[PDB]
Amino acid sequence: QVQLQESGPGLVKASETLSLTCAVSGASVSGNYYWNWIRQSPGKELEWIGNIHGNSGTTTYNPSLESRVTISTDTSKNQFSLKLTSVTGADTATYFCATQFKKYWGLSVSSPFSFSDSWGQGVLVSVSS
Amino acid sequence: AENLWVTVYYGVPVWKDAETTLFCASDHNVWATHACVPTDPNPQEIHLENVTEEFNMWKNNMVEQMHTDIISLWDQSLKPCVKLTPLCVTLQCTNVTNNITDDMRGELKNCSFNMTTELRDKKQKVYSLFYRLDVVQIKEYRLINCNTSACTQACPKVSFEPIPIHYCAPAGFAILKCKDKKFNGTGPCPSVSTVQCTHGIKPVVSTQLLLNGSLAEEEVMIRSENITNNAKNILVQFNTPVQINCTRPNNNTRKSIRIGPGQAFYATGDIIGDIRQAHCNVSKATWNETLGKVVKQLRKHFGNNTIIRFANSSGGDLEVTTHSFNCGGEFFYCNTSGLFNSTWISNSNDSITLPCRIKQIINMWQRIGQCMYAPPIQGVIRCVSNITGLILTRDGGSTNSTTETFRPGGGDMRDNWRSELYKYKVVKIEPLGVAPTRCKR
Amino acid sequence: NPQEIHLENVTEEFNMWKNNMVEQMHTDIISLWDQSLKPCVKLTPLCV
Amino acid sequence: AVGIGAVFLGFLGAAGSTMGAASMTLTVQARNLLSTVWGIKQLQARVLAVERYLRDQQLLGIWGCSGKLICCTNVPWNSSWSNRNLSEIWDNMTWLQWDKEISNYTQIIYGLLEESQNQQEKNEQDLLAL
Amino acid sequence: DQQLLGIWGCSGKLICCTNVPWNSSWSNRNLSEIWDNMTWLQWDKEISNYTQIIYGLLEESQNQQEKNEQDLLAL
Amino acid sequence: AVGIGAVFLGFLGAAGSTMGAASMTLTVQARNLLSTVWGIKQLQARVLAVERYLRDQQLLGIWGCSGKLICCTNVPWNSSWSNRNLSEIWDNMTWLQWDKEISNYTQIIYGLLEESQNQQEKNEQDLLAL
Amino acid sequence: DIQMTQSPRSLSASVGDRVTITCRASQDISPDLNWYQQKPGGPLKLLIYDASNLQGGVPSRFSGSGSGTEFTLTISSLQPEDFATYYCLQYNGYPWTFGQGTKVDHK
Ligand SMILES: *[C@@H]1O[C@H](CO)[C@@H](O[C@@H]2O[C@H](CO)[C@@H](O[C@@H]3O[C@H](CO)[C@@H](O)[C@H](O[C@H]4O[C@H](CO)[C@@H](O)[C@H](O)[C@@H]4O[C@H]4O[C@H](CO)[C@@H](O)[C@H](O)[C@@H]4O)[C@@H]3O)[C@H](O)[C@H]2NC(C)=O)[C@H](O)[C@H]1NC(C)=O
Ligand SMILES: *[C@@H]1O[C@H](CO)[C@@H](O[C@@H]2O[C@H](CO)[C@@H](O[C@@H]3O[C@H](CO)[C@@H](O)[C@H](O)[C@@H]3O)[C@H](O)[C@H]2NC(C)=O)[C@H](O)[C@H]1NC(C)=O
Ligand SMILES: *[C@@H]1O[C@H](CO)[C@@H](O[C@@H]2O[C@H](CO)[C@@H](O[C@@H]3O[C@H](CO)[C@@H](O)[C@H](O)[C@@H]3O)[C@H](O)[C@H]2NC(C)=O)[C@H](O)[C@H]1NC(C)=O
Ligand SMILES: *[C@@H]1O[C@H](CO)[C@@H](O[C@@H]2O[C@H](CO)[C@@H](O)[C@H](O)[C@H]2NC(C)=O)[C@H](O)[C@H]1NC(C)=O
Ligand SMILES: *[C@@H]1O[C@H](CO)[C@@H](O[C@@H]2O[C@H](CO)[C@@H](O)[C@H](O)[C@H]2NC(C)=O)[C@H](O)[C@H]1NC(C)=O
Ligand SMILES: *[C@@H]1O[C@H](CO)[C@@H](O[C@@H]2O[C@H](CO)[C@@H](O)[C@H](O)[C@H]2NC(C)=O)[C@H](O)[C@H]1NC(C)=O
Ligand SMILES: *[C@@H]1O[C@H](CO)[C@@H](O[C@@H]2O[C@H](CO)[C@@H](O)[C@H](O)[C@H]2NC(C)=O)[C@H](O)[C@H]1NC(C)=O
Ligand SMILES: *[C@@H]1O[C@H](CO)[C@@H](O[C@@H]2O[C@H](CO)[C@@H](O)[C@H](O)[C@H]2NC(C)=O)[C@H](O)[C@H]1NC(C)=O
Ligand SMILES: *[C@@H]1O[C@H](CO)[C@@H](O[C@@H]2O[C@H](CO)[C@@H](O)[C@H](O)[C@H]2NC(C)=O)[C@H](O)[C@H]1NC(C)=O
Ligand SMILES: *[C@@H]1O[C@H](CO)[C@@H](O[C@@H]2O[C@H](CO)[C@@H](O)[C@H](O)[C@H]2NC(C)=O)[C@H](O)[C@H]1NC(C)=O
Ligand SMILES: *[C@@H]1O[C@H](CO)[C@@H](O[C@@H]2O[C@H](CO)[C@@H](O)[C@H](O)[C@H]2NC(C)=O)[C@H](O)[C@H]1NC(C)=O
Ligand SMILES: *[C@@H]1O[C@H](CO)[C@@H](O)[C@H](O)[C@H]1NC(C)=O
Ligand SMILES: *[C@@H]1O[C@H](CO)[C@@H](O)[C@H](O)[C@H]1NC(C)=O
Ligand SMILES: *[C@@H]1O[C@H](CO)[C@@H](O)[C@H](O)[C@H]1NC(C)=O
Ligand SMILES: *[C@@H]1O[C@H](CO)[C@@H](O)[C@H](O)[C@H]1NC(C)=O
Ligand SMILES: *[C@@H]1O[C@H](CO)[C@@H](O)[C@H](O)[C@H]1NC(C)=O
Structure with missing residues (x-):
């Protein structure tokens, strides 16, 4: 099973860059995976920040935050990082x-089905003026 | 009632422990990569879920294969090089006393001798600077190896720098890797993957200290085949590295003497400026913190109220009594006595300086009858390295006293390879299987 | 009695300047020349 | 349909899976069995691998299961070899455990298969004689 | 080569025709302009880029056929 | 039922027996065909053995007798090869004697078998075309 | 962007009661929708994937149905551990939009 653990600074100042890291065990970042960064503010609805393809590196960010989000991957450390300016x-x-991904138990994309997903414990970040 | 029948399957995922011969994979050097295959740019790893394997670092044949391959490569590298047969002559030596300090008195000898030339009816008179460890008195001296065997000179083009090497298994076999942190090398590993071959392993040769190695991802790790037995060495792996800076400051000079048709001997001409001792430096606070971590981990196995002592080496050959290594072609032997000297009881910018010596006639592996003459390096030399582990030995250990004393050890190079291949093993696949099934032919 | 089979309608592409047979022949000739000289006298004492 | 990943069980990935699930990927294992002093050792290893492959293929051909990955036979299953029912074998066990359990009843099954296949060949020849 | 032939169910045969249908995207030419107006070298040059997918299709088809045969013999 | 010995005809033990009796133990013979300077010779011998085995298997496969020890064919028996009847062959002669007798009519039979198998494959393809 | 409306915003029920939650999308996204559960101060647990397939390990009481622009999550028999916030998510087209979250507590 794939396990994910988040880390980063618990407090950041206004107008600064927030850097977060997520380390994955049980799988490889370079594999055919879609690594996702999401956020939830206190008492509000979940907001999907962005995603990156592990194998190809293609990135897709939320249009609202497309001008301030940067998602990268580190294969040597087996992790992926988010930067919010x-x-x-x-x-x-x-x-x-x-x-999240689909694990196939046979050959080619026709054989049964196995949906798998993993979410980390999450890290709380507060922005101070 | 069962009416079941034997049915055969080919390709079942089953394996057994086995021994085989692995081959190269790598991205003028003594460790020849010419006869080694290129490595895949994107290595593949398959994590096996629900597979718990059995591992034992002290019964791994890969260590033996690595030792044999390293020795074979070292032997091969020296074959097409000059043999210093004519160097066993009667030397006439004098003390060097030009701009020397109080600790380099008598270490260097200025020795003159007769030598052959390209024409076999002519002789020349030459001189060179030798080390006190290389010449033995017969005002007449001789090289230390002359009564044991004649032996060769390393060619000056090959480099001694280690290069990473990967070991990949043949078809029909597989390499299992234990991904479980805190794994002490022996027992069951729940978390396992399959690799085509291992990470790059640098064949670094050293004693009493592991240099340029791998670091534990979590904390200091202590490993021993039988920790109750005092005759077994203890391998300590650090969590963070400790930087060490070594240097030979003498501005050496090299000259060539033609001893025959297309054969040259590289002698030390003269030293420019002052003459001082080579030495190494290691930070004090970092070493104290590392030893604190090490004693904290050692208390786990040897009681919580035991006094833990670090003392000097017992004795023996210079190779095993001192931290011996090679820094840019020059072979250092250094006195790690300021490091392992302290006692621990249950409850700024200065650095420790190790002064130390250099040698030129080398018996690298534990063998007798084969040397290796290292030609001198021109100019000052300096190097920096990471300490990432120790090899310790427990002296005595009787129940009479409640104090445990640990001393540095080493000598055998298999312990150096064992610290890197502890989480790997080799198995062979068994694709034929039989089961009950309800057909009938 | 060597055998030759003429292939009809086959038009091939040839390039003499990138033929590995030449390299193999050169290596084999050099190896044979080196091998022939091994069991022969070495004139070391003639340097006088 | 966007933001979804696809991953296939690779080589020994089905080692921890049950027998029934592991029996659906025999080809990935089957394809991997085939593919101066040091050259001698490398060539010896290659020759040994080829010999092992040929020995396995010869055994399969002798049992009459040539060219098949799954080949059910005519030999009945003696209850002495095992007592467990199919429910507790193909859905609650793995191939490694089965190999460990049955490792001491392997050769007699091979001999039975050989003799059975010889009998079928003789009977087929007799039938075709008419 | 022999293992590749065997995995597709064509063991011990020189001409072994299979169950995989011919996708028109691989080649639009009809049998008249293939078997009587072309050569094997030209065909190999033509279809040199659609080879591996056909191999995978053959493998999966043979696996399905073996499974179905076992299920039929179970009854 | 105590004090009785059980001995099996081993390897070439049937070399002196008749053809019919010798044809009942083909497996014991079949299994035995597969299993610094001196290493070269040993490896050369091993490679030669493997090549011989593969050549024999290819010859068997080309005739349509793949994976069989007793495979019957469609080629009629020309009387010019041997006039003896089945009574004086399978019950009053040995395989070595038969090999000595028919040692000069072997290749033509092989060619006939090859051509017959090719024709059978073509006809089978034509039948399946419908 | 595909907008999601989840109802009821807040629901109160007792143990053993049947709970129904509806989620509607601005456009057809079927069968691409998942249902997740989140406890206070903990990570989200996947209950249903593809809107009709029960995730492995989830209790059989949870079920999902619907299609088009209307999907439903049903808990046949509510349990003490079922009091949580339930969300509906889509992946047919970016951006990935979550529901406002239906909160089920003890009456
Ligand atoms: C642990 O790792 C660290 C780093 O990972 C190691 O430290 C490195 O050590 C290497 C080798 O000593 C060193 O590279 C040398 O740097 C010298 C100074 O810049 C260079 O002069 C030297 O080049 C000479 O040697 C090469 C062969 O090694 C030749 O190919 C080259 O042409 C040079 O040789 C010329 O010069 C010499 C001297 O004048 C002369 O005799 C020759 O005839 C020729 O004319 C190397 O490039 C790195 O700089 C070190 N890294 C750091 C950060 O200091 C350390 O050694 C490792 N520890 C152990 C125990 O192995
Ligand atoms: C490694 O082992 C674990 C369990 O030890 C495997 O997970 C198990 O997978 C099976 C089948 O995928 C699950 O069985 C299912 O049970 C549910 C509920 O009973 C049933 O509705 C399904 O029809 C199916 O039978 C089983 O629950 C599950 N175990 C757990 C604890 O979740 C896992 O698949 C193994 N790894 C691999 C690679 O096979
Ligand atoms: C070696 O050769 C000898 C003879 O050359 C073999 O012994 C022969 O065995 C056959 C069958 O086992 C005997 O046939 C018998 O013939 C009598 C004739 O009246 C018949 O009544 C029986 O019913 C049977 O058919 C044959 O007599 C016997 N020969 C002798 C001289 O006794 C022997 O078997 C051969 N060895 C091996 C290992 O095959
Ligand atoms: C080693 O000894 C030699 C020979 O005594 C020294 O070389 C002599 O150096 C002096 C000047 O110092 C010259 O006048 C002589 O001509 C040199 N002799 C020869 C034969 O060249 C050499 O200096 C000594 N080296 C050291 C370090 O003391
Ligand atoms: C080099 O050889 C010469 C002679 O070939 C040595 O000079 C002789 O030394 C011996 C002492 O062992 C004297 O008895 C001779 O009279 C000397 N002969 C001459 C011609 O000088 C010289 O000592 C040798 N050099 C070294 C360093 O040993
Ligand atoms: C000594 O250890 C340090 C720390 O581990 C090494 O510096 C690391 O080098 C790797 C190169 O693979 C980088 O990925 C890390 O980011 C570096 N870490 C830091 C903190 O700088 C250093 O290279 C080691 N020195 C030697 C000679 O091996
Ligand atoms: C680890 O070493 C200890 C010390 O040798 C072993 O215990 C000894 O076993 C021998 C065996 O005959 C006895 O004679 C000694 O009296 C034992 N000494 C003590 C202090 O118990 C121990 O068996 C070794 N561990 C393993 C697993 O073999
Ligand atoms: C090891 O440490 C000693 C000091 O304990 C260093 O000696 C100093 O070296 C610097 C070189 O930049 C000189 O400027 C100082 O004058 C030296 N001081 C003394 C007291 O000798 C030595 O250089 C260090 N060596 C290495 C290789 O790090
Ligand atoms: C070993 O050598 C390294 C590099 O020469 C030393 O690191 C330097 O230390 C000085 C003084 O603190 C700094 O100004 C440099 O920026 C450092 N450079 C690098 C690359 O780290 C290190 O202090 C030395 N350690 C010992 C124990 O002598
Ligand atoms: C470890 O420390 C001891 C204690 O200093 C060293 O023993 C010394 O050995 C030298 C010989 O070179 C004697 O001159 C000293 O008198 C000894 N010390 C004492 C207190 O008697 C020992 O040599 C050190 N270990 C090593 C390997 O050098
Ligand atoms: C390693 O270093 C230690 C510390 O300097 C050496 O121990 C000293 O040895 C000298 C002998 O020349 C004594 O005069 C000192 O009293 C010793 N120091 C202490 C603290 O006891 C030791 O000798 C060195 N190793 C070797 C092999 O010489
Ligand atoms: C050289 O110096 C050493 C150390 O001072 C001394 O022991 C030796 O006797 C000296 N040899 C001479 C002056 O020949
Ligand atoms: C060579 O000489 C040294 C010192 O004179 C001695 O220790 C060693 O044993 C000698 N070697 C042999 C083989 O006698
Ligand atoms: C540490 O090694 C000992 C050696 O007997 C073993 O019993 C123990 O299980 C090992 N520790 C772990 C965590 O595997
Ligand atoms: C060593 O001596 C040479 C020759 O005088 C000089 O060029 C070089 O700079 C010296 N090296 C150092 C480190 O002083
Ligand atoms: C060893 O430690 C003692 C501390 O009691 C100290 O006095 C002594 O100088 C140390 N020796 C060395 C060689 O550092």
Whole structure:
């Protein structure tokens, strides 16, 4: 099974860059996986930040945060990192790193089905003026 | 009632422990990569879920294969090089006393002798600077190896720098890797993967200290085949590295003497400026913190109220009594006595300096009858390295006293390879299987 | 009695300047020349 | 349909899976069995691998299961070899455990298969004689 | 080569025709312009880029056939 | 039922027996065909043995007798090869004597078998075309 | 962006009661929708994938149904551990939008 653990600074200042890291065990970052970064602010709805393809490196960010989100991967450390520039008060939230995929028990994409997903414990980040 | 019948399957995922011969994979050197296959740019690993295996680092044949391959490569590298047969002559030596300190008195000898030339009816008179460890008195001296065997000179083009090497198994076999942290090398590993071959392993040769190695991902790890037995060495793996800076400061000079048709001997001409001792430096606070971690981990196996002592080496050959290594072609032997000297009881910028010596006639592996003459290196030399482990030995250990004393050890190079191949094993697949099934032919 | 089979309608592409047979022949000739000289006298004492 | 990953069980991935699930990927294992002093050792290893492959293929051909990955036979299953029912074998066990259990009843089954296949060949020849 | 032939169920045969249908994307030419107006070298040059997928299809088809045969013999 | 010995005809033990009796133990013979300077010779011998085994298997496969020890064919028996009847062959002669007798009519039979198997394969393909 | 409306926003029920939650999308996304459960201060647990397939290890009481622009999650017999926030998520097209979260507590 794939396990994910988040880490990063618990407090950041306004207008600074928030850097978070998520380390994965049981799988490889370079594999055919979609590594996801999501956030949830206190008492609000979940907001999907962005995603990156492990094998190809293609990145897709939320249009609202497309101008301030950067997702990268480190194969040597077996992890992936998120950078959020120009953080503000609204950015205070709990950030989660996730990944979901389909595991096939045969050959080619026709054989049975096995949906798998993993979400980390998450890290709370607060932005101070 | 069962009406079951034997049915055969080919390709079942079953394996057994086995021994085989692995081959190279790598991205002028003594460790020849010419006869080694290129490595795949994207290695593949398959994590086996629900598979718990059995591992034993002290019964791994890969260590033996690595030792044999390293020795074979070292022997092969020296074959097409000059043999210093004519160097066994009567030397006439004098003390060197030009701009020397109080600790380099008598270490260097200025020795003159007769030598052959390209024409076999002519002789020349030459001189060179030798080390006191190389010449034995017969004002007349001789090389230390002359009564044991004649032996060769390393060619000056080959480099001694280690290069990573990967070991990949043949078809029909597999390499299982234990991904469980805190795994002490023996017992069951729940978490296992399959690899085509291992990470790059540098064949670093050293004693009493493991240099340029791998670090434990979590904390200091202590391993021993039987920790109750005092005759078995203890391998300590650090969590963080400790930087060490070694240097030979003398501005050496090299000259060539033609001893025959297309044969040259490289002698030390003269030293420019002052003459001082080579030495190493290691930070004090970092070493104290590392020893604190080591004693904290040692208390787990040897009681919580036991006094833990670090003392000097017992004795023996210079190779095993001192931290011996090679820094850019020059062979250092250093006195790690300021490090392992302290006692621990249950409850700024200065650095420790190890002064130490250099040698030129080398018996690398534990063999007798084969040397290796290292030509001198020109100019000052300096190097920096990471300490990432120790090889310790427990002296005595009787129940009379409640104090445990540990001393540095080494000598055998298999312990150096064992610290790197502890989490790997080799198995062979068994694709034929039989089961009950309800057909009938 | 060597055998030759003429292939009809087959038009091949040839390039003399990138033929590995030449390299193999050169290596084999050099190896044979080196092998022939091994069991022969070495004139070391003639340097006088 | 976007933001979804696809992964296939590779080589020995089905080692921890049950027998029934592991029996659906025999080809990935089957394909991997085939593919101066040091050259001698490398060539010896290659020759040994080829010999092992040929020995296994010869045994399969002698049992009459040539060219098949799954080949059910005519030999009845003696209850002395094992007592467990199919429910507790193909859905609650793995191939390694089965190999460990049955490792001491392997050769007699091979001999029975050989003699059975010889009998079938003789009977087929007799039938075709008419 | 022999193992590749055997895995597809064509063991011990020189001409062994299979169950995989011919996708028109691989080649649109009809049998008249293939078996009577072309050569094996030209065909190999033409279809040199659609080879591995056909091999995988043959493998999966043979596996399915073996499974179905076992199920039929179970009854 | 005590004090009785059980001995099996081993390897070439049937070399002196008749053809019919010798044809009942083909497996024991079949299993035995597979299993610094001196290493070269040993490896050369092993490679030669493997090559011989593969050549024999290819010859068997080309005739349509793949994976069989007693495979019957469709080629009629020309009377010019041997006039003896089955009574004086399978019950009053040995395989060595038969090999000595028919040692000069072997290759033509092989060619006939090859051509017959090719024709059978073509006809089977044509039948399946419908 | 595909917008999601989940109802009821907050629900109160006792142990053993049948609970129904509806989630509607601005456009057809079937069968691409998952149902997740989140306890206070903990990570989200996947209950249903593809809107009709029960995730391995989930109790059989949970079920999912619907299609088009209307999907339903049903808990046949509510349990003490079932009091949580339930969300519906889609992956047919970016961005991935979650529901507001239906909170089920003890009456
Ligand atoms: C642990 O790892 C560290 C780093 O990972 C090791 O430290 C490195 O050691 C190497 C080798 O000593 C060193 O590279 C040398 O740096 C010298 C100074 O810049 C260079 O002069 C030297 O080049 C000479 O040697 C090469 C062969 O090694 C030749 O190919 C080259 O042409 C040079 O040789 C010329 O010069 C010499 C001297 O004048 C002359 O005699 C020759 O004839 C020729 O004319 C190497 O490039 C790195 O700089 C070190 N790294 C650091 C950070 O210091 C350390 O050694 C490892 N520990 C152990 C125990 O192995
Ligand atoms: C490694 O082992 C674990 C269990 O030890 C495997 O997970 C198990 O997978 C099986 C089948 O995929 C699950 O069985 C299912 O049970 C449910 C509920 O009873 C049933 O509705 C299904 O029809 C199916 O029978 C089993 O529950 C599950 N175990 C756990 C604890 O979740 C896992 O698959 C193994 N790894 C591999 C690679 O096979
Ligand atoms: C070696 O050769 C000898 C003879 O050359 C073999 O012994 C022969 O065995 C056959 C059958 O086992 C005997 O046939 C018998 O013939 C009598 C004739 O009246 C018949 O009544 C019986 O029913 C049977 O058919 C044959 O007599 C016997 N020969 C002798 C001289 O006794 C022997 O078997 C051979 N060895 C091996 C290992 O085959
Ligand atoms: C080693 O000894 C030699 C020979 O005595 C020294 O070389 C002599 O150096 C002096 C000047 O110091 C010259 O005048 C002589 O001509 C040199 N002799 C020869 C034969 O060249 C050499 O200096 C000594 N080296 C050291 C380090 O003391
Ligand atoms: C090099 O050889 C010469 C002679 O070939 C040595 O000079 C002789 O030394 C011996 C002492 O052992 C004297 O008895 C001779 O009279 C000397 N002969 C001459 C011609 O000088 C010289 O000592 C040798 N050099 C070294 C360093 O040993
Ligand atoms: C000594 O140890 C340090 C720390 O482990 C090494 O520096 C690391 O080098 C790797 C190169 O693979 C980098 O990925 C890390 O980011 C580096 N870490 C730091 C903190 O700088 C250093 O290379 C080691 N020295 C030698 C000679 O091996
Ligand atoms: C680890 O070493 C100890 C010390 O040798 C072993 O215990 C000894 O076993 C021998 C066997 O005959 C006895 O004679 C000694 O009296 C034992 N000494 C003590 C202190 O118990 C121990 O067996 C070794 N561990 C293993 C697993 O073999
Ligand atoms: C090891 O440490 C000693 C000091 O304990 C260093 O000696 C100093 O070296 C610097 C070189 O930049 C000189 O400027 C100082 O004058 C030296 N001080 C003394 C008291 O000798 C030595 O250089 C260090 N060596 C290495 C290789 O790090
Ligand atoms: C070993 O050598 C390294 C590099 O020469 C030393 O690291 C330097 O230390 C000085 C003084 O603190 C700094 O100004 C440099 O920036 C450092 N450089 C690097 C690359 O780290 C190190 O202090 C030495 N350690 C010992 C124990 O002598
Ligand atoms: C470890 O320390 C001891 C204690 O200093 C060393 O023993 C010394 O050995 C030298 C010989 O070179 C004597 O001159 C000293 O008198 C000894 N010390 C004492 C207190 O008697 C021992 O040599 C050290 N270990 C090594 C390997 O050098
Ligand atoms: C290793 O270093 C230690 C510490 O300097 C040496 O021990 C000293 O040896 C000298 C002998 O020349 C004594 O005069 C000192 O009193 C010793 N120091 C102490 C603290 O006892 C030791 O000799 C060195 N190793 C070797 C092999 O010489
Ligand atoms: C050289 O110096 C050493 C150390 O001072 C001394 O023991 C030796 O006797 C000296 N040899 C001479 C002056 O020939
Ligand atoms: C060579 O000489 C040294 C010192 O004179 C001695 O220790 C050694 O034993 C000698 N070697 C042999 C083989 O006698
Ligand atoms: C440490 O090694 C001992 C050696 O007997 C073994 O019993 C123990 O299980 C090992 N520890 C772990 C965590 O595997
Ligand atoms: C060593 O001596 C040479 C020759 O005088 C000089 O060029 C070089 O700079 C010296 N090296 C050092 C480190 O002083
Ligand atoms: C060893 O430690 C003692 C501390 O009691 C100290 O006095 C002594 O100088 C140390 N020796 C060396 C060689 O560092």
